[PDB]
């Protein structure tokens, strides 16, 4: 059981090294997760100065193993079943009429802490577009993730569309393609099709002088 490792509160560390149009940056994050209640509380900082993209565009990249799977759904929790060795999480995120992100992450236990270590590569962005121009509202519209098994990679796949509010009206689409594959060689729970539903709240810490984002999330799976 990898589920056992998530019975209480788990400390979380998130580390991202990024390059978007050659603009290098790093994000460091910390918080905790409670999969019994499906809750995450995290704070991220840009360790290199001003984040050169908007914070909301990184929410998806910055630990679906903390989803609350209800009792009748435990057998479909691929994420936890891969712990502690972890899983690799890869995405291409296409920003409509703009560039795309390519992310590759290891999600795994380092001793006591659940870690999410990410490499991100962004290309083909417009310098004065919504992303590199910072024209997105500091808020979030979540969207359901339809999890499918990817039996050839012994993991899962998903394709979901995120809508980012544009300053002064407008919606910027972020088309997410995702595949996960286990880091370990142990057996894994390959799920029937289901959804992950999450709700994200972005806020700020008044005392924090670095470019940062405070993130709270509720997350739950749901069958059929």
Curated annotation (Swiss-Prot):
Record GO biological process: bioluminescence; generation of precursor metabolites and energy
Annotated phenotype, changing residue 219 to R: In Azurite; shifts the excitation and emission spectra to shorter wavelengths and increases quantum yields compared to BFP
Mutagenesis / variant outcome for changing residue 217 to G: Suppresses the 399 nm excitation peak, leaving only the longer wavelength peak at 475 nm
Mutagenesis or variant effect for residue 162 to T: In P11; increases fluorescence at 475 nm excitation and at warmer temperatures such as 37 degrees Celsius. In Esmerald; leads to brighter fluorescence. In VisGreen; leads to brighter fluorescence
A Pfam match: GFP
Consequence the record notes for mutating residue 145 to I: In Azurite; shifts the excitation and emission spectra to shorter wavelengths and increases quantum yields compared to BFP
Reported biotechnological use: Green fluorescent protein has been engineered to produce a vast number of variously colored mutants, fusion proteins, and biosensors. Further generation of mutants led to more stable proteins (at 37 degrees Celsius for example) with brighter fluorescence and longer fluorescence lifetimes.
PTM entry text: Contains a chromophore consisting of modified amino acid residues. Maturation of the chromophore requires nothing other than molecular oxygen.
Expression by tissue: Photocytes.
Keyword Secreted: no
Keyword list, A-Z: Chromophore, Luminescence, Photoprotein
Reported effect, residue 171 to A: In mut2.1; shifts fluorescence lifetime from 3.03 to 2.50 ns
Subunit structure: Monomer.
Family (UniProt): Belongs to the GFP family.
Protein's job: Energy-transfer acceptor. Its role is to transduce the blue chemiluminescence of the protein aequorin into green fluorescent light by energy transfer. Fluoresces in vivo upon receiving energy from the Ca(2+)-activated photoprotein aequorin.
Protein name as annotated: Green fluorescent protein
Name of the gene this protein is made from: GFP
């Amino acid at each position: 059981k990898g589920e056992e490792l998530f019975t209480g509160v788990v400390p979380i560390l998130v580390e991202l090294d990024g390059d978007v149009n050659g603009h290098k940056f790093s994000v460091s994050g910390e918080g905790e997760g409670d999969a019994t209640y499906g809750k995450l509380t995290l704070k991220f900082i840009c360790t290199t100065g001003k984040l050169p993209v908007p914070w909301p565009t990184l929410v998806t990249t910055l630990v679906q193993c903390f989803s609350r799977y209800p009792d009748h759904m435990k057998r479909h929790d691929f994420f936890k079943s891969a712990m502690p060795e972890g899983y690799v999480q890869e995405r291409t995120i296409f920003f409509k009429d703009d560039g795309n992100y390519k992310t590759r992450a290891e999600v795994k236990f380092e001793g006591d802490t659940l870690v999410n270590r990410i490499e991100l590569k962004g290309i083909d962005f417009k310098e004065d577009g919504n992303i590199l121009g910072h024209k997105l509202e500091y808020n979030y519209n979540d969207h359901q993730v339809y999890i499918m098994a990817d039996k050839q990679k012994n993991g899962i796949k998903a394709n979901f569309k995120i809508r980012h509010n544009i300053e002064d009206g407008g919606v910027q689409l972020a088309d997410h393609y995702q595949q996960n594959t286990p880091i370990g060689d142990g057996p894994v729970l390959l799920p029937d099709n289901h959804y992950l539903f999450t709700e994200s709240t972005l806020s700020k810490d008044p005392n924090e002088k670095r470019d940062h984002m405070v993130l709270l999330e509720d997350v739950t799976a749901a069958g059929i």
